[PDB]
Design an enzyme around this catalytic site. Sequence first.
Site, PDB file in Angstrom:
ATOM      1  N   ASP A  94      32.156 -28.334 -41.478  1.00  0.00           N
ATOM      2  CA  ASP A  94      32.461 -27.938 -40.109  1.00  0.00           C
ATOM      3  C   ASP A  94      32.773 -29.166 -39.260  1.00  0.00           C
ATOM      4  O   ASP A  94      32.021 -30.146 -39.263  1.00  0.00           O
ATOM      5  CB  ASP A  94      31.289 -27.163 -39.510  1.00  0.00           C
ATOM      6  CG  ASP A  94      30.951 -25.909 -40.298  1.00  0.00           C
ATOM      7  OD1 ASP A  94      31.878 -25.267 -40.836  1.00  0.00           O
ATOM      8  OD2 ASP A  94      29.754 -25.563 -40.377  1.00  0.00           O
ATOM      9  N   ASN A 140      25.341 -28.257 -43.290  1.00  0.00           N
ATOM     10  CA  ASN A 140      24.091 -27.674 -42.825  1.00  0.00           C
ATOM     11  C   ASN A 140      24.260 -26.223 -42.406  1.00  0.00           C
ATOM     12  O   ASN A 140      23.279 -25.591 -42.001  1.00  0.00           O
ATOM     13  CB  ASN A 140      23.513 -28.491 -41.669  1.00  0.00           C
ATOM     14  CG  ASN A 140      22.843 -29.765 -42.145  1.00  0.00           C
ATOM     15  OD1 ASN A 140      22.515 -29.899 -43.325  1.00  0.00           O
ATOM     16  ND2 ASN A 140      22.616 -30.697 -41.228  1.00  0.00           N
ATOM     17  N   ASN A 141      25.472 -25.685 -42.501  1.00  0.00           N
ATOM     18  CA  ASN A 141      25.701 -24.277 -42.214  1.00  0.00           C
ATOM     19  C   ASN A 141      24.993 -23.438 -43.269  1.00  0.00           C
ATOM     20  O   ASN A 141      25.279 -23.562 -44.464  1.00  0.00           O
ATOM     21  CB  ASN A 141      27.199 -23.990 -42.208  1.00  0.00           C
ATOM     22  CG  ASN A 141      27.533 -22.636 -41.624  1.00  0.00           C
ATOM     23  OD1 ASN A 141      26.801 -21.666 -41.814  1.00  0.00           O
ATOM     24  ND2 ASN A 141      28.650 -22.562 -40.910  1.00  0.00           N
ATOM     25  N   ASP A 189      31.540 -35.588 -39.041  1.00  0.00           N
ATOM     26  CA  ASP A 189      31.893 -35.562 -37.631  1.00  0.00           C
ATOM     27  C   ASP A 189      30.690 -35.714 -36.712  1.00  0.00           C
ATOM     28  O   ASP A 189      30.868 -35.786 -35.492  1.00  0.00           O
ATOM     29  CB  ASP A 189      32.618 -34.253 -37.289  1.00  0.00           C
ATOM     30  CG  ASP A 189      31.707 -33.040 -37.382  1.00  0.00           C
ATOM     31  OD1 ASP A 189      31.102 -32.834 -38.454  1.00  0.00           O
ATOM     32  OD2 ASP A 189      31.594 -32.296 -36.383  1.00  0.00           O
ATOM     33  N   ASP A 201      31.620 -33.602 -45.166  1.00  0.00           N
ATOM     34  CA  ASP A 201      31.058 -32.525 -44.369  1.00  0.00           C
ATOM     35  C   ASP A 201      32.157 -31.496 -44.107  1.00  0.00           C
ATOM     36  O   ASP A 201      33.352 -31.798 -44.182  1.00  0.00           O
ATOM     37  CB  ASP A 201      30.483 -33.065 -43.063  1.00  0.00           C
ATOM     38  CG  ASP A 201      29.953 -31.969 -42.164  1.00  0.00           C
ATOM     39  OD1 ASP A 201      29.043 -31.231 -42.596  1.00  0.00           O
ATOM     40  OD2 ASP A 201      30.444 -31.849 -41.023  1.00  0.00           O
ATOM     41  N   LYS A 253      20.824 -32.464 -44.448  1.00  0.00           N
ATOM     42  CA  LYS A 253      21.117 -33.790 -43.922  1.00  0.00           C
ATOM     43  C   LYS A 253      20.690 -33.865 -42.458  1.00  0.00           C
ATOM     44  O   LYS A 253      20.831 -32.881 -41.721  1.00  0.00           O
ATOM     45  CB  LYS A 253      22.610 -34.105 -44.077  1.00  0.00           C
ATOM     46  CG  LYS A 253      23.559 -33.036 -43.550  1.00  0.00           C
ATOM     47  CD  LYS A 253      24.985 -33.277 -44.041  1.00  0.00           C
ATOM     48  CE  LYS A 253      25.934 -32.165 -43.606  1.00  0.00           C
ATOM     49  NZ  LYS A 253      25.991 -31.996 -42.125  1.00  0.00           N
TER      50      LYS A 253
HETATM   51 MG   LIG Z   1      30.011 -31.113 -39.053  1.00  0.00          MG
END
Ligand SMILES: [Mg+2]
Lengths: 292, 286
Positions: free
Chosen positions: B27, B59-60, B229, B25, B204
């Site tokens: 961010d 997911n950004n 995270d 991932d 996700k």
């Molecule tokens: Mg993240």
Amino acid sequence: GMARCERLRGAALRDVLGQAQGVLFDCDGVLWNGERIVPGAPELLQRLARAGKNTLFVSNNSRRARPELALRFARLGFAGLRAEQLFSSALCAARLLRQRLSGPPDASGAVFVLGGEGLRAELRAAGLRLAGDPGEDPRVRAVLVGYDEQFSFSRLTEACAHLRDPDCLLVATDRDPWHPLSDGSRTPGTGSLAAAVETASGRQALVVGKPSPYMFQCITEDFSVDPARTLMVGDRLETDILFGHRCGMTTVLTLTGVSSLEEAQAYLTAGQRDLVPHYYVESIADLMEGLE
Amino acid sequence: MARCERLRGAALRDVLGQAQGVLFDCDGVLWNGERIVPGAPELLQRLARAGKNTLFVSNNSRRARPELALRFARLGFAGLRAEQLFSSALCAARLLRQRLSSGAVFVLGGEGLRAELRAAGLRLAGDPGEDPRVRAVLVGYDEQFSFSRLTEACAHLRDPDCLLVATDRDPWHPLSDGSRTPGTGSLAAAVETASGRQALVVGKPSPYMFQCITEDFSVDPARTLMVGDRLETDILFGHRCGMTTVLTLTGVSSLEEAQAYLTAGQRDLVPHYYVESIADLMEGLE
Ligand SMILES: [Mg+2]
Ligand SMILES: O=c1cc(-c2ccccc2)oc2c(O)c(O)ccc12
Ligand SMILES: [Mg+2]
């Protein structure tokens, strides 16, 4: 150096591809013919991508605006491509018209288009107003000649009437004289229709599509392309190969399309240097032997 | 059953040694805002020198693939390929193209999301010229979300044939100053409630994000480390896909939240391993 129309294989293929930063593909007759892809063409693009080789695509076909052209690539099995990699004569024509017709809002004008819906859509996406669209037609400030299945004497007459105004621009997507169809027949190309418009109007058209260098300018406006490190792969000597020579690229003729090896060798014997491919392949699938 | 164990020493060497690749991932893992996680660039280097594949999920939906690739390089991550980057924007564009194989898409989102859809060959409502029938509504991270735009989305959704898609269901996202911003999950909840529709979610923990990866790469989930995270998205995603999950503490979720899930028996939300930061993983490579 001087092109010698040499078959690209073995060490020559490995060296040429290894030093190349990217490949510029023509579409029709190279990646596909109609609904039939050239066998191995999708796999080549994949292996080129995994080798860190950039790929761009040119076509004088104006039937599909960029959105539909990208869908075509995906539908036929070419995955991982982005629409911004696709440079059709329709796109380049819209850019030129936008560049030339940009100005005061009160003086924007309209474009009279001899062409199909895909070409009209590409111009609209660039912000251009089209004669014949809903509502009052503004002053026609340009005539665009493209592949026009509805070409008629009356519309030829109408285009020339607009061109009596010397400030009205004349643009042509390309000068391809004809195109082959699946059934073995041929269809007239923009070059034939442009010749009619130019002759009846007494004007010289601005041509955007290959072999015009403007098509490469459109690419360099969006991407950093070192022509000396770029392979130009095409099927038509008088458009794709001439295009490569004018832009300083290494040219590769593929034999799955319009031009033949005999036509290429005839240009070499005559010393017509800019129409001789540097290399040739039976099909672009042959290029995969230079990767991995 | 996962036990959220600190990955160190021999266990770290074994886990990294057996893995073919790492799925990161972005961010909260590689960076927070403009501040990279210390040691993150070096980790990717050593992973590459060890023959470990690296892929990236996020997911950004704010950045299209080209701009996301530029971000990696600008922040010190060299040698990466755009084909390694799988954002919810990219996967959303792919789903819509398949389902609409076209019509136009009404996008509640930013320019990066629109650009990603345009790159896939999709036409967007509101773009110059063409006015096709709206055949899908896409909800993404939309800082321009408004009552009028919500009303427009629902009008299109009165057509039962108009699809509803959401990039993700993240409820909120943290900012550098400790504040939060609403996530796509909050805007999707409004659209779903006002339209009476359930959205197709691509990001996700939805498995479609992994389908997008496997369509482009041969990935053995049993040999892949999912590093994230956020327990409710990254870790759940890993469990659903059969990957070994590693929680890093440089982002949203805390070790206490993970241990709280373990105490409650929520297996699919318990990370297999955890690290204070992904830099701790470098000790298993050489
Ligand atoms: Mg993240
Ligand atoms: O620019 C065009 C080129 C061609 C073409 C046909 C055969 C082989 C190669 C190219 O077909 C077109 C077409 O069918 C249209 O409806 C509109 C435009 C075009
Ligand atoms: Mg051709």
